[PDB]
Amino acid sequence: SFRFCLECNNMLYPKEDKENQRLLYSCRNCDYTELAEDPKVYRHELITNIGETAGIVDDIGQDPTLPRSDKECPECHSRDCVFFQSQQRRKDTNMTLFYVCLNCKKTFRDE
Amino acid sequence: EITHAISSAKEQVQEIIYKAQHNELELKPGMTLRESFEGEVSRTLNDAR
Ligand SMILES: [Zn+2]
Ligand SMILES: [Zn+2]
């Protein structure tokens, strides 16, 4: 997660303080240079799961098309929950489900 | 007899569906989990008919 400039409001890019060997972050517009917290500089993923539980809203109980199941709510023992499968849309994704209770709005699963 | 056979095949398809949803289906070579699920269901229903 890359930050932005406290002065110029642009984005900070990595750099090296060769006289201290500490990863700074250099503004390509201004001369401001702040200390950073995380020495990680890059990431790449192929086995991702972002979009697993993100497909839920507060008023998802108001959707009248979601099928309703009799699974017990682990939270409040509620015998009425709407359910749906993984909102990730890849080809190899599971068919495992997600379960949303209409009482506490806590999401749960059957595992 | 015909309606019993059709009901038995519907139960078989529902069992395949349960197995796929609880992650218990056996994949096939050169074939995805979803393509395996669809192939097994199509096999069951063709044999039902
Ligand atoms: Zn800057
Ligand atoms: Zn609940």
Helix content of chain A: under 10%
Number of strands of chain A: 6
Separation, N- and C-terminal Cα atoms of chain B: 12 Å
Total helices of chain A: the number is: 0
Class from helix and strand fractions of chain A: mainly beta
- CA gyration radius of chain B, whole angstroms: 12 Å
Strand content of chain A: 15-25%
Which two chains share the most extensive interface? Answer: A-B, 8 and 8 residues
Top CATH class of the largest domain in chain A: Mainly Beta
Organism (chain B): Komagataella phaffii (strain GS115 / ATCC 20864) (Yeast)
Protein name (chain B): DNA-directed RNA polymerase subunit
Subcellular location (chain B): Nucleus
Family (chain B): Belongs to the RNA polymerase beta' chain family.
Task: Tell me about this structure.
The structure is cut from a larger assembly and holds chains A (111 residues) and B (49 residues). By secondary structure, chain A is mainly β. Chain A has 2 domains: 1-44, Single Sheet (N-terminal domain of TfIIb), CATH 2.20.25; 45-111, N-terminal domain of TfIIb (Single Sheet). Chain A has no helices and 6 strands. Chain B has 49 residues and is mostly helical. Chain B has helices at 2-21, 33-48. In chain B, helix 1 (2-21) runs antiparallel to helix 2 (33-48). The longest helix of chain B is centred in the N-terminal third of the chain and has 20 residues, at 2-21. The radius of gyration of chain B is 12 Å and the shape is elongated. Bound molecules: zinc ion (2 copies). Residues 73, 75-76, 78, 101, 103-104, 106 of chain A line the site of one zinc ion. The PDB classes it as transcription/dna/rna. The entry lists the keywords Transcription-DNA-RNA COMPLEX, rnapii. The entry is titled "RNA polymerase II elongation complex containing 60 bp upstream DNA loop, stalled at SHL(-1) of the nucleosome".
In short:
The structure is cut from a larger assembly and holds chains A (111 residues) and B (49 residues). Chain A is mainly β and 111 residues long.
